Design a protein around this ligand. Structure first.
Ligand SMILES: CCCCCCCC/C=C\CCCCCCCC(=O)OC[C@H](COP(=O)(O)OCC[N+](C)(C)C)OC(=O)CCCCCCC/C=C\CCCCCCCC
Ligand SMILES: CCCCCCCC/C=C\CCCCCCCC(=O)OC[C@H](COP(=O)(O)OCC[N+](C)(C)C)OC(=O)CCCCCCC/C=C\CCCCCCCC
Ligand SMILES: CCCCCCCC/C=C\CCCCCCCC(=O)OC[C@H](COP(=O)(O)OCC[N+](C)(C)C)OC(=O)CCCCCCC/C=C\CCCCCCCC
Lengths: 267, 267, 267, 267, 267, 267, 267
């Protein structure tokens, strides 16, 4: 009735909620537009594609209006915990979606906090190998020796071995020279030691191994482990190998073809 | 009794909730229909299949009616946190279901924020390789060299290496020429250097390697690493290889068949 | 005492809760039965197995009675957040169980929103390959070339490459013809070019490669890359290959058996 | 003091909570026992092992007493949200534990909602292949051709390809007949076409391919693709192959051994 | 002031909380000790290592004191939701840690609810194969044929195929007899059929295949598929194979060595 | 105004909160220091590295001050649920980080609750194999036969097969003796049975198999399965094998080299 | 109206919230700046890159302003649980992103709590092997024998085997000497035992095996297992192997080439 308003004053609390609910909305909407403008303005400023910038700004818009709408529903007195539990799980959905996306971000942060490599540092990121051109924040671009550009996601980097090459200035070449069984072991060892000692780029302060490593099927395999600076490594390999090939057939030592004893049976 | 209503006025709060609960429903239903219309209208406008558009609009319908029903139950005074905890986990279920679906969306956003490739850019997305036709938002369509169309999900792209080819204009061809052990190393090197120097598409400012790389089982393998523009790469390979094949059997150098020494035992 | 009821009137609030709790139950039970009927009725209407329809309708029954029971316990004043936190995690359990089940549903939605393939479109879904018969909502049935029916879950599809064949009408055949080293390169190239030019189904506006691709161990391998319509591809392969086999041993060119030089040592 | 009880009546609320807390316990305990009886009774009724039935009934017992204890603590006024957040995560622990267990349940539900196979339907569930004996709810038992019983969890089924065989009644046999290079191609094709046409179980309305598929290293390989009913497939393979073996060495065509040209060098 | 206590009586509520907080602690501590005793007593009673029993009882101690401390802090009025959210995630940490531990428990429950194998039942649990000695609750111990004891975690069992052998009493032996191309097919088939028919342990009611399965490179391979009881399987294989080896070189049929045609070129 | 304090007394509640907030802080800080001392003192007492002990004690410090600060903010009346939801997820972050760390702890608890192996028990933990030296709580140290020390994390143990060797005292040696096709089967079987019967360490109560297992390509392979105590296994293998090698070339039986029939064609 | 303020005094509570909300902001902002300064100052002090230090300090800034803004919204009376549930899931997103980043931190803590290796301790971390240079907190740098620097993330270490070499001072060399079948077994064993006994670096207190291990295809393989100190291991291998190669062709024992019996058929 008309007198019902006079006795009690808690009906005030029913009324202020109403305009308060409007005050959740008419502030929430113009903000949702406003932010959706600014987020767009700071998207195009970074030169990011317009069909995507519009969509992400619209996502922000459609999220802030959702916040203010659910807040107004809770303001008047609707128990909005249901929708809340749903879009919380939607945030969880996009979070587990962006798991593999943000893992690359965290790994890119780690790769500059501490630096397993820099721009211009030859590496092998678990397979592919090349000179890093630039460690970006979501990916690591590197030029392999074949001239290809490989864009590795940083999460695949930090989740695996980072086999650097250009950190230590000195590395090792390993030759496996297969000679014949009938060759004199001491002759091979001395005519190889002369090679690796007359080569000036091989470091003598390190270990210079020339020792019999394997009794192969057809051949007998000598290992030659010689250290050289990381820039002179491949040239040392090629030069020492050409010198082996020349000094052996000068000395009469024969690199054997795949041998095969043949027992003969005429039938 | 009849006098029980007179002393206390909090019974009002029991009453307004009732119509308020109706005001959760008769507004919630017509909205649930209304949105379920509009969501359908903006589904068919995008030419999306009707049996699926109807189902998704019905999902929105059956979700908004759930919100308003749980809200009315909370309005009258039912403690609806149980159902809330259930459909929150249902939202979580569809979220972890849409994890692999929305990861492709996030990756498609990243692939246009920063561009590891564009339409018409030959790439190799961890295995398969081809010219990208169009980077869509959920997938990346590319035409391989065999004429097949490969539709790669962007999450499989960003989660792996993006081996581009058409970014850097210059690449490297690597020949591995196997000649016989009895061939003169210097003759091979000079008759190969003449080939790679008389070829005008090979870039001379880069490194032109012709050096002995391996002592094979039957053969001795020379590596030839020569740089050329990324368009002239395969033609340079084919031409230099034909020229090798012709200049070697002109010069007498023999590409060896798989050799096999045979020790004979008549028994 | 008996006078204790007269001074205070909040004891009313203790009383209405009681029948209110009954009003949580006697409405919750008949609904739980009622829905459990209708859910069953709309399960058998879809011809779904009765021992499973009964179980799922009983699950709905045993869930709605759980909601109303916990709600009545919260109504009287029990703090039911414990059981709530438990069956919320049970909903989470079935959600993470239905993760791999609903991922197929989401992927089936995506496969008709945008269509990497239609019914009758030959494809290769990361391994297995065949003509799609029907893209259902949880799975994709396709008939391989061997006549087998392969029912691929859509989550395994969207999570991998979709190598289509019947989208682009033109594809490429790649022959690798191994001839002997002593054969004339120009003779082989011209007697192959005549073959691929006199074949009318090979498209001449495309690239018609006949160029020396590899110096094999025993053979020398010419690549022949010729484009043809996707229907005439296999027949072109077979015809061009028969023609190669006939024109070569007409022209004297020999396809070599695996050669092996044998150095002889009588011991 | 003694007068402190007279002025205020909210002390009543402190008192009723006490017996109310007892009313959380003396109802919670006898229920926890009671359910723990019934859950056991409906466990042994299904013939489930007693040392496990006792443990699961004790789990239910120790969970319901936990609910009522935490509820009594919240009743008196303890803020029990800590323990709540802990056993909620314990429910989450058992949920993520039962993830791989309930995924099989959901997949078993899907495998009878829609049926990629029935009892007695030869299939190949991503590797292993056999006749399904019975699709249970957690697993799928099938007898392979070697007589082994393979119990596949349904989550491993739905998560992979379901290569059926006994759905389509017609399938394809593919022979790869390697003959010698010196054999007449037309003779081979006609003496094979006569075989596959005089075989009555080969379906002639389908495609009957006999065409030259490969120029092998030693051999030349003809493909023979012939369709037959899925029951007569293996017998057709064996019969056509025996007939090939007999008609070829009747016709003089020779299946070649691995050929190897040998260039001889006496040294 | 001193009069401030007289007007208001809610200060009582500040006071009872204090001793109530003590009543959270002096009950919580002696329980935490008490349970930590009993949990230890029921750990040593099961003969579980003392350095671990002490640690787990101390974990229970340090957890119950945490509950009562946080509860007292919430009792006085501290908002303890922060620490709550932290040790809830700690419970989640140990839960995701015990994921792989409790999955074995759930699988061990399943392996006795329904039994894919019993003690003494030869099986192959995805690789390793042997006679199950005892299915414990966390693991499955089985003795392989080589006498090794293999303790398989039940989660690795239920997550993979369970290839039983000792369920069905009858199994199949598959011989692949490679004979020469020049051998009479009918002679081989009849002298094999006589073998598999004169063997009394081979079941004749089943299928007794002796049919030409493959045209090998050097040999021609006959398949012999014969069924026998699962105990007599290996002995049947060995006996039938010895009989094949004897009856063939009695009948003149020759098992061929790897043949190789050699085209000779003196150069 | 000045009279505003007189009418209402709830302003008291605004005031006590203030010093109460201080009572959240001046107790929270000195505790945070105090615990951060004791946690450090019980870290150095266990000889744990100081740069890490300081960091973990500082983590405890910076966490307890966070608790008391958020609690004071909630005390005065700030709604601190935002920060709470953030550091709850931070606790979740460290929990999912410590997932693989605490899984090893749980597995180490299981490996001493029930013992698949003890110190000095030769095992093979899914690959690597050796004698366990000590099962620690986070790892399992074992010395392989090559003298290497392998520190296996217990989660990698419990998550895989535990192939024990030193539990059962008796194991099986399996020889696969390849003899020539022209050798007498009965002679081989009897001259092998004499070997395995005259060897006293072979257990005769077990099964002593000497039966023809395979018709190899070049050889015919007899299996010899003989049981011996787990300590005498390798010595039995070596002795029986030396005896086979000696008694066969005493008896004239020849172990065949890889045979190869050569069909000759002079061209 | 103007009299509305006089009757009720709860309007005070509406007013103090307002400036209180300002007191959430004007304290929250200057702190957010202040911390964002100090966090930057303690970032540059550690020499961390400025473009990243600025971003992380801005993240802290934009997070603390978010806390105070949401707190002010909750202060005035907005129900801010929606945004809370969103940025809680954002914290969860960065947490699951930093999962693989912080797992390395936890593993680096474990690798110094207990030490499977120290700086200068040769190891093999599941594949790659080298001398550890320094165990950092996020990674483990080690120099392999080839001179490469390998930076292993500690999570890849603790998650796999840690095959140490330099813990135990004594290790085992295993030679597999393949001699001919016609060689005297006792001669080989004694001329090998003399070698391994006249070598002073081989430990005689350990086991010195020289026993016939395998009947190879072409060869007969003797195993020689001899223990030596971990520093003298490779030199012992090389010396004993050279001595074998010399003493055998001194004694007439022949290391056999791959033998092959050839049955001859002139056709
Ligand atoms: C999946 C299914 C999960 C189920 C798990 C089973 C766990 C079993 C454990 C405990 C349940 C025992 C029930 C004990 C009943 C006494 C409850 C009591 O202690 O009451 C105290 C109240 C105090 O009132 P307050 O001032 O603090 O206001 C409260 C404020 N509020 C209005 C928050 C909204 O006193 C009152 O209100 C008036 C009290 C009137 C009590 C009447 C007796 C109960 C009658 C009907 C309810 C039937 C419940 C269904 C039981 C099913 C068991 C399976
Ligand atoms: C898996 C299971 C996990 C369990 C973990 C075990 C952890 C054990 C830790 C602590 C237990 C200590 C119990 C101390 C009892 C005194 C409690 C107290 O401090 O109460 C103070 C109350 C204040 O009330 P308020 O005005 O602030 O309104 C409160 C508003 N509310 C109505 C929110 C709905 O004063 C009152 O009301 C009257 C106080 C009446 C106290 C009577 C003595 C207790 C009698 C029966 C309850 C027995 C509980 C079962 C114990 C199980 C131990 C294992
Ligand atoms: C890891 C760490 C994370 C930390 C994140 C830092 C974010 C910083 C953001 C905001 C901090 C701003 C502090 C502003 C202080 C004014 C607070 C205020 O506006 O309060 C208004 C109240 C209204 O009262 P009410 O009727 O609504 O009852 C409330 C009911 N309740 C009893 C729920 C249980 O008025 C009152 O009660 C009396 C108000 C008296 C205010 C005295 C000034 C503050 C003094 C001491 C508190 C120190 C806090 C520590 C700050 C550390 C910053 C890092």
């Amino acid at each position: 009735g008309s007198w019902l308003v006079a006795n009690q004053a808690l009906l005030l609390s029913y009324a202020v909620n109403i305009v308060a609910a409007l005050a959740i909305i008419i502030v929430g909407l113009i903000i949702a537009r406003m932010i959706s403008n600014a987020v767009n303005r700071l998207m195009i400023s970074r030169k990011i594609d317009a069909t995507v910038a519009d969509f992400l700004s619209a996502l922000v818009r459609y999220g802030i209006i959702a916040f203010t709408l659910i807040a107004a529903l809770g303001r008047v007195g609707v128990q909005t915990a249901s929708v809340i539990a749903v879009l919380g799980a939607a945030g969880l959905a996009v979070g587990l979606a962006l798991q593999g996306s943000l893992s690359n971000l965290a790994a890119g942060v780690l790769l500059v906090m501490f630096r397993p490599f820099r721009a211009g540092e030859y590496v092998d990121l678990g397979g592919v190998a090349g000179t890093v051109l630039s460690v970006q924040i979501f990916s690591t671009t590197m030029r392999t020796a074949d001239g290809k550009i490989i864009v590795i996601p940083n999460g695949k980097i930090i989740a695996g071995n980072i086999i650097n090459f250009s950190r230590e200035p000195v590395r090792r070449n390993e030759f496996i020279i297969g000679v014949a069984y009938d060759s004199d072991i001491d002759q091979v060892k001395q005519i190889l030691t002369n090679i690796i000692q007359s080569e000036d780029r091989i470091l003598k302060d390190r270990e210079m191994t020339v020792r019999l490593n394997e009794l192969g099927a057809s051949s007998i395999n000598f290992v030659v482990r010689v250290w050289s600076n990381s820039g002179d490594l491949q040239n040392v390999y090629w030069d020492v190998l050409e010198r082996i090939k020349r000094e052996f057939d000068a000395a009469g030592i024969s690199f054997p073809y795949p041998q095969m004893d043949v027992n003969f049976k005429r039938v």
